[PDB]
């Protein structure tokens, strides 16, 4: 193929000068003379036959003049059912110590998004079992979900709840893309998936393919690992007809990694130091996640919000690429209520009476309204106290605290959708205003609530 030479190595950016055969942008180049495979992704053409590249692993030991070979195509990962149950890094090498991934097909991680005429309108709600999510902002099959939250609100554990419930209750070859997250948590998730039967090391009937580029990787790797996960899911949709799940945890690192590359790429910085090309690059990524007429890819994305801002360029840009966002708030997490889903910040596009029904829609709007009025009344109770206010107002405050408690869900619970709306109606109408406020904390449906009330009353 085409052979160039390294001319400059600055941090994680490598300049390569090709005599003949200049490689197009986004091509992958292999560095010769190294024990481990070091791939460089082309980013810029700088003239005089010189290209700028982002390294996929650490760049120590590189020499000015080291030969570099051109692959002639973007980073090509192995795709197929043989990737199920395995762990591959950003470039498609196995990192599970089980041998090579013997697939029949290779796919480039840089591909165009589906067209306009390939778009689907079908929106069928996927019930997950959680009262807060399935009640206020329930998930839809084929749409992108998104799970915003700061550091320590419960995004990982929420995505693990979702992995358990959904990925086991599903038959469509899920994919998990670990975009720059802790290696300890990745090992934990791998082992508890193995011992949960979702991954079978023997007689492979596995149903989840794992992609991992963790935190100690260079920024280019953490920027392209989400594309690797996308490519696997795109195979399982396009050339398999399946309805795929794609758990991307965590997506902000993707954006974050983008920032960390742009600095050295010779580009003027944008707001918050993010790159000038944040929105459109995250867009080229997120538009490949969609339901076409060939298959669907419903994506559960955990999204890191720096300093719980939600106005930072990365979360604010992601928000528009989602169909049912549920934001995990820190102020609710310090209350001990779990999951920490923010009821007044989680939006769903299928929460309309044409899809979920008038009963579910009315319960959702009533719960959100009573919580908003509760926050409003918290002003007057913080000044004077509840013992100095109206009658139905403190009754509403009590009902709202009961709802705040019943939004929690731990033994683990499984609360069906109709049972969920039933319980929340029974609390909203006031059918159980005699039961104490902490009987609804960490329980399932209304039955376990009234039962824990009975027990707590029997002792105290």
């Amino acid at each position: 193929a085409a052979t160039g030479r390294i001319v400059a190595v600055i941090g994680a950016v490598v300049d390569v000068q090709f005599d003949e055969g200049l490689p197009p942008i986004l091509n992958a180049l292999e560095v010769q003379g190294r024990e481990t495979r070091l791939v460089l992704e082309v980013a810029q053409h700088l003239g005089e036959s010189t290209v700028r590249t982002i390294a996929m692993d650490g760049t120590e030991g590189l020499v000015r003049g080291q030969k570099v070979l051109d692959s002639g195509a973007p980073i090509k990962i192995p795709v197929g059912p043989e990737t199920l149950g395995r762990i591959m890094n950003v470039i498609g090498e196995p990192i599970d110590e089980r041998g090579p991934i013997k697939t029949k097909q290779f796919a480039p991680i840089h591909a165009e998004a589906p067209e306009f005429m390939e778009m689907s309108v079908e929106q069928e709600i996927l019930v997950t079992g959680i009262k807060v999510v399935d009640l206020l902002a329930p998930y839809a099959k084929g749409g992108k979900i998104g799970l915003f939250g700061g550091a320590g609100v419960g995004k990982t554990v929420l995505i693990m709840e979702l992995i358990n419930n959904v990925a086991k209750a599903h038959g469509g070859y899920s994919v998990f893309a670990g975009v720059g997250e802790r290696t300890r948590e990745g090992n934990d998730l791998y082992h508890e998936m193995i011992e949960s039967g979702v991954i079978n090391l023997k007689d492979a009937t596995s149903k989840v393919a794992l992609v991992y580029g963790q935190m100690n990787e260079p920024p280019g790797a953490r920027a392209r690992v989400a594309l690797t996960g996308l490519t696997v899911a795109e195979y399982f949709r396009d050339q398999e007809g399946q309805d795929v799940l794609l758990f991307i945890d965590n997506i902000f690192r993707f954006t974050q990694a983008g920032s960390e590359v742009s600095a050295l790429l010779g580009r003027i910085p944008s707001a918050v130091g993010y790159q000038p090309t944040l929105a459109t690059d995250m867009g080229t990524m997120q538009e490949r996640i969609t339901t076409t007429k060939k298959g669907s890819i419903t994506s559960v994305q955990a999204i890191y919000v720096p300093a719980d801002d939600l106005t930072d360029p990365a979360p604010a840009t992601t928000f528009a690429h989602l169909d049912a966002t549920t934001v995990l708030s820190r102020a609710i997490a310090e209350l001990g209520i779990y999951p920490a889903v923010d009821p007044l910040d989680s939006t769903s596009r299928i929460m309309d009476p044409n899809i979920v029904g008038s009963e579910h829609y009315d319960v959702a709007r009533g719960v959100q309204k009573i919580l908003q009025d509760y926050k409003s009344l918290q002003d007057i109770i913080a000044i004077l106290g509840m013992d100095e206010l109206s009658e139905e107002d403190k009754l509403t405050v009590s009902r709202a605290r009961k709802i705040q408690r019943f939004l929690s869900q731990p033994m683990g619970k499984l609360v069906p959708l109709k049972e969920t709306i039933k319980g929340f109606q029974q609390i909203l109408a006031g059918e159980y205003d005699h039961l104490p406020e902490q009987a609804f904390y960490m329980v399932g449906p209304i039955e376990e609530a009234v039962a824990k009330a009975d027990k707590l009353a029997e002792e105290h």
Binding site: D19, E20, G47, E48, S49
Partner: protein, 187 residues
């Protein structure tokens, strides 16, 4: 390594390359020789064909340096100037070599001891008094010095002379005297 700096110091890439060339020639005493050499090189380049051959940013550096090494082996150029053009092709500063040439010229222009005088008048200058002013301007110099006198005319200065010796400057024109007298009667 010790470097021989010329009496005049020129700046830019042009000045840096010409200073390198001068300090290389001064260690072997081939200054006017390489002056002849770069004169020939500049007149070689100023022809349109080879100029567009070296001005093209699409020709790859090996191809253009190949043509340059061929044409410099054609004219049996000294290794010094061949190395200089090789460095201008290596660093990609080749299209600017003309300036370097000019630069070197000005450098050696103070090696032989010439000073440029520029005489502006309101009228196209006569012959007798022009030679007279040449003789007058020669008296402001040390020995071993030469006058590069180039008298162009400005018919707007309303009279007198404006003489520029190096950067020394004498404004004997009449428009400035008119402006000064107006300023005096005004303040």
């Amino acid at each position: 390594a010790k470097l021989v700096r010329p009496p005049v110091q020129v700046y830019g890439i042009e000045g840096r390359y010409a200073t390198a060339l001068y300090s290389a020639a001064s260690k072997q005493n081939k200054l006017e020789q390489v002056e002849k050499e770069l004169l020939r090189v500049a007149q070689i380049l100023k022809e349109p064909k080879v100029a567009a051959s070296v001005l093209n940013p699409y020709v790859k550096r090996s191809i253009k340096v190949k043509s340059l090494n061929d044409i410099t082996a054609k004219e049996r150029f000294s290794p010094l100037t061949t190395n200089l053009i090789n460095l201008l092709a290596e660093n990609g500063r080749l299209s600017n070599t003309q300036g370097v040439v000019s630069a070197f010229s000005t450098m050696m222009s103070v090696h032989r001891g010439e000073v440029p005088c520029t005489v502006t008048s309101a009228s196209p200058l006569e012959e007798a008094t022009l030679s007279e002013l040449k003789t007058v301007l020669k008296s402001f110099l040390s020995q071993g010095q030469v006058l590069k006198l180039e008298a162009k005319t400005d018919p707007s200065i309303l009279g007198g002379m404006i003489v520029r010796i190096g950067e020394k400057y004498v404004d004997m024109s009449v428009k400035t005297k008119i402006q000064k007298l107006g300023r005096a009667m005004r303040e």
